[PDB]
Amino acid sequence: KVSTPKVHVYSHFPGEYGKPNTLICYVSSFHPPDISIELLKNGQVMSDTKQTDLAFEKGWQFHLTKSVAFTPEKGDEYTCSVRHMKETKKFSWEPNM
């Protein structure tokens, strides 16, 4: 009956400090299909994020993507927050710059 989300946080391009990029949180393979996602910078919810309409594939797979334009700088922390089944989990963007 229930499946926990598989979550990935990543940039579109290789991160380089001071360079404009896109931050992406991809969420997949969860049951039930009620979910919520936020992108966070330095612990505040980011504005101007974009979310895809929930996608359903092959009679079993749900997926959702949340994205935002960003520019990484030293000491900043970026996280994706995912709530499913009453639990919120946080996933950090961990590049090696």
From TrEMBL:
Cellular-component GO terms for this entry: extracellular region; MHC class I protein complex
Keyword Ribosomal protein in annotation: no
UniProt entry keywords in alphabetical sequence: Immunity, Immunoglobulin domain, MHC I, Secreted, Signal
Subcellular location, record wording: Secreted
Family: Belongs to the beta-2-microglobulin family.
Domain Ig-like: 5-92
Principal subcellular localization: secreted
Phylogenetic placement of the source organism: Eukaryota, Metazoa, Chordata, Craniata, Vertebrata
UniProt GO BP: antigen processing and presentation of peptide antigen via MHC class I; immune response; response to metal ion
Name by which UniProt lists this protein: Beta-2-microglobulin
Claim: Signal is one of the keywords in the record: yes
